[PDB]
Amino acid sequence: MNIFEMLRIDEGLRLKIYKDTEGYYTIGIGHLLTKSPSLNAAKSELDKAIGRNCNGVITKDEAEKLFNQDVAAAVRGILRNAKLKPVYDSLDAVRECALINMVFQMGETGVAGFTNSLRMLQQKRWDEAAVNLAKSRWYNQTPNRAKRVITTFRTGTWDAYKNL
Ligand SMILES: [Cl-]
Ligand SMILES: [Cl-]
Ligand SMILES: [Cl-]
Ligand SMILES: [Cl-]
Ligand SMILES: [Rb+]
Ligand SMILES: [Rb+]
Ligand SMILES: [Rb+]
Ligand SMILES: [Rb+]
Ligand SMILES: [Rb+]
């Protein structure tokens, strides 16, 4: 396991624009294009992201290209975020993947708002953090994915992803 394989399990791979679990236009491996309800707005975002006239369809190589950009940018953003950087640096490499996963799904601002859970993680109070993380819109709306991420935080193992 690693962050790419983890997020590939959680996000899937689709080569045509589709709506994510929130109803938002997405493509590839969880690449959010826009929150606009306009498919045309989403198609414009896509073409700009890829650098060609895609009309809503990409290749697997292109999907992987956006995915590595998105993972790299999630890590870089965490390290530039005053709330998330200390927690990231305090965590072992497996638990860091859980944090990257959350940022990938909900964005930096959203994760940075989990003040109490972040403190528990920094304190290495793993079972307490796991309890707290579940008390969230996040968990309610995507409970099975959140369970996997939370198990990763609680245990520092890949048990919730082996073999998905
Ligand atoms: Cl982009
Ligand atoms: Cl604990
Ligand atoms: Cl709690
Ligand atoms: Cl889910
Ligand atoms: Rb997805
Ligand atoms: Rb629409
Ligand atoms: Rb670390
Ligand atoms: Rb994403
Ligand atoms: Rb907060």
Curated annotation (Swiss-Prot):
Endolysin with lysozyme activity that degrades host peptidoglycans and participates with the holin and spanin proteins in the sequential events which lead to the programmed host cell lysis releasing the mature viral particles. Once the holin has permeabilized the host cell membrane, the endolysin can reach the periplasm and break down the peptidoglycan layer. SUPFAM superfamilies: Lysozyme-like (SSF53955). One of its GO terms (biological process) is viral release from host cell by cytolysis. Substrate binds at residues 32, 104, 117, 132. Changing residue 11 to Q: Complete loss of activity. GO terms for cellular component: host cell cytoplasm. GO terms for molecular function: lysozyme activity. This is Endolysin. It comes from Enterobacteria phage T4 (Bacteriophage T4). Gene3D superfamilies: 1.10.530.40. Its EC number is 3.2.1.17. CDD domains: T4-like_lys. Optimum pH is 7.3.
